[model samples]
Target: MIPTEEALRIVFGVSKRLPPVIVSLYEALGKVLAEDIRAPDPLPPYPASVKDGYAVVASDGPGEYPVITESRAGNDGLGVTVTPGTVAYVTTGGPIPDGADAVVQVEDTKVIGDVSTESKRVKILIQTKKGTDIRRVGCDIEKDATVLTTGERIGASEIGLLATAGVTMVKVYPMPIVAILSTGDELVEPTAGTLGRGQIRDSNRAMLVAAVMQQQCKVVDLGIVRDDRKELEKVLDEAVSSGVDIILTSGGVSMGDRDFVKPLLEEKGKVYFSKVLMKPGKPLTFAEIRAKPGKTVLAFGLPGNPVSCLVCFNIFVVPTIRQLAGWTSPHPLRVRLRLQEPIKSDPIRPEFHRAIIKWKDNDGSGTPGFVAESTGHQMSSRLLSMRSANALLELPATGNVLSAGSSVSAIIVSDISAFSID
Candidate 1:
């Protein structure tokens, strides 16, 4: 078995970044930009009105001017020009007509003609200054401005900005296609009617698929493969042939005689480490198989236990996916949090306790900080232990009891505010 830190180092050393691809803006959310995005043209290419007002020559103030035409948004300005002693009605985001230096808001002016028809004249109630209420060309964004840079994660706001900049497609790091599988002769589908005497429902594949999808990845559900070595090899071959970037399998990686994942990986690719010195995931195996001349496929053999599989996915697979998807820093959020209740540590391996973390303004200790409370029983097979857990408290391997107020490092697994304070 290898240490967790060393194993992570090995994983990162072999995890290669996938090539970038051009995708539509709608499908680019949450992807890292592979190219720098620059504005092709200045925002509001023309002088636009910031308010619903009359575009007029600012020097002609405090007097009624003929309403030559109307300039509504999304339509031409009627090809009308606002010369001296003349005005054009313009709405917000509407272009300011030619020869117009300012906009006099409707509130500061009164329509002097035709209550039922188009206003023929408008009287200015206040003196106007040049450039008032007029958004000049390139005022919002400059031509060739850097809207976004390479390696930036695209979010909803970034999408809005890209749309605003008239960018329909973008070059982004592609989402890796992950193939998820489960192994064991006693495994059966979850929808089966009645369980056999020694059969168990396959839950790890679904759970892992959900986890992979949550990372903005595409997952191919390879279903369950029995403990046969030839079947495992065939499935792996199919995964590679399908051009998947990563393969995740739960079970068949331990020391059992029927365990074929380690041997198959050793036969087909390079197995970095077959075991990790961590509780619930000691049988974790990581390997790399060459798919093509310049492509490498990553494979992670997770533990059979549900909780162990989940914890391993969060700890190892998540970062591997991120690094492959072009994240510069792929580590998850970790913070030192005070314990709300005491916790016991394992004697041999460090146990990551499933816990709920909350932010407190003041916990009567005069300092505002984060505190954690465990999510009940933390057995490897008890999937319920992770039901409400947003963090994993990393306890040392030394056999000792951590007091309630002591601080321990917590690895954030999900949103902390997902639960109510109660």
Candidate 2:
């Protein structure tokens, strides 16, 4: 078994940058920018009024002025420009007139009659202070200015910003295509009903498929393969030519006699260490295959155990995928929580125990405590536990049994919807 940090380093060492592609702004959400996006023109092409008010010259003091022009959004103020001793009726988002330097809110101004057709016969009851509600040109974004930098995750707001900057399409890192394969002849589909004495239902494929999809990547299900070396080699060869960026397989990589993943991968790729020091995932394998002349494929031979596969994916594989997707800050969301009950541990290897986390306090001031339970049994075949667990309570590598009310770090795997204290 290798150390946890050492296993992580090996995974990171195989990280390969993803290629860039041009995608429409509508489809660019949640993708990382491949290049710096600069504004082609100012966000507001012209000076605009931010409120429904009157455009007035700042030099005009507190006095009523003639209403010479009226401006509304999408109208050019009828080609009327504001001059000294005159103000124009401007609505929100309307462009300011040429001679107007500031705006006065409509609330501060009172009109006596309909001033549109009266020409020079309009009356004003009060005067407003200058610069009340005016949006200047280039205030939000300037022309040729960098609006978004590379590696930035594009979201809805960024999409709007890009659209406002006249960017219809953006260059973004392509989403990684991940292929998930499961092995073992004893495995059967969950919908196929209860298995016989020594048989079990296949779950690693479904679990990893969902997890990989959650990372915004495409999933290619390679289905189940038997324990035969020749059959396994055939499917693996097909996986290499399927245009997938990363290949993940469960089982057949351990020290057992039936393990064929290591030998097959070694024949076509460079296999790294076949073991890690983490519990439930100690038999994890990392490898890279030279698929074609200049094409390389990274592969992970994860443990066949359902819980181990999920844990290793979150800890090791996710980071590599994030790096390949051109994400600069690629790290899991870590949070520290207090343990509700004591937990015993192995002094040598770090234990990732299945836990159900809940908020103990009602006030939401103090930290929440997590209860680390064994999920009935720690057997690798008990996938029922993985479905029931909401979080993973991480125990240190050197500690024994911890007492109740102890503080430990945990990762929130599921959404905590509600908390009710009795």
Candidate 3:
């Protein structure tokens, strides 16, 4: 039996890098950038008005002055110079004309109108500083500077920044389109008619389908196929021929009479390793088949049990999807959490104990650290433990029970508290 770390090394060693593609800004959300985003021009390209009032000499405040002319944003006539004892009527974002050093906001000044003629003037009631209310050139963004770096996932805020910087399209690492096939004749579709004496509803398919989709990857659902060799082979043939990046199968990986996954993979491709020294997921298999001369399809044959399927996917398959999506660090994030209850683990293999991680109320250090409580009955087939589980406590295989209050490292699957229902 090989250690899980050794298996992880081998699996990632055979992983291939996917090529980048150019996509529109609207379609680039959640994609990793392939190139640096640079600003085309400085923001606030000219000295502009930040307030709706009069632009005048800094020393002319606290006294009335004649308004020389009106300057509106996106229009000409801001070049008209203001002579002594005169001010210019400027709106927000309007360019400041030359010879004006400050702006007195409309709220601080009263307009002293005469016959409503061309002699438009206003009185300033506050002493405004020289540079107050005036936006300098290139103040918000410098010209031709790198605004966004490569390899970062694009989100809403990034879209706004890129749009303002004149970026219409960008080259990004594309999200992988995975093909999911659930194996076995004993399995019936969830929507199929009442189960017979020997059949069980196929819960693994729906469960895994939801798991992969939650990772933001696309799914090609090839419904449940029976135990026939020719039938399973045909589905595999079509999936590769259809050009999928990864093929995920839920059963038929162990040394069983009807297990066709292992043999078929060895015949058409290469199986790196088949088992791991871990609980809940030991029959995990990773293989690769050349779809064409230059393209290859990676396959993950997860355990048949529901909890094993979820655990194996989070540990191994998630990284593969992340690597294909262009993440440098494709491993699931692990953090330290205080144990809420004592736990027991397998003696000779590292066990992934399912747990619900929460922010405890005043867990001692000012801002409390995360605390983990075991989701009861962590059997391989017990899918109920999967609910309310946001983390996996990496319990060592030392044949001892861990005590409560001891801190342990855990793999954070999905911190439920971090998400919000908008």
Clashing pairs in 1: none
User: Which digits, one per residue and each the tens of the lDDT, describe model 3 over residues 179-257?
Assistant: 9988988898898787898898898888878988888888999989888888888898888778899988888987889
Q: List where candidate 2 sits over 4 angstroms from the true fold.
A: 114-129, 358-378, 388-390, 412-422
For residue 273, give model 3's deviation from the true position in Å. 1.1
For residue 219, what is the lDDT in candidate 3?
93
Instruction: Give the alpha-carbon lDDT of every model.
Output: 0.89, 0.79, 0.85
TM-score of each: 0.92, 0.90, 0.93
Please tell me which model should have the higher lDDT, number 1 or number 3. 1
Give a tens-digit lDDT track for model 1, residues 91-202: 9989888888999898999888677875587888988999999889999889999989999999998998899888898999988899999999999999988898999999
lDDT of 2 by residue, 373-414 (tens): 446455565777676676677778876887766667776665
Report the error of model 1 at residue 152, Å.
1.8
Give the C-alpha lDDT of model 2.
Answer: 0.79
- Model 1: lowest-lDDT 10 consecutive positions: 413-422
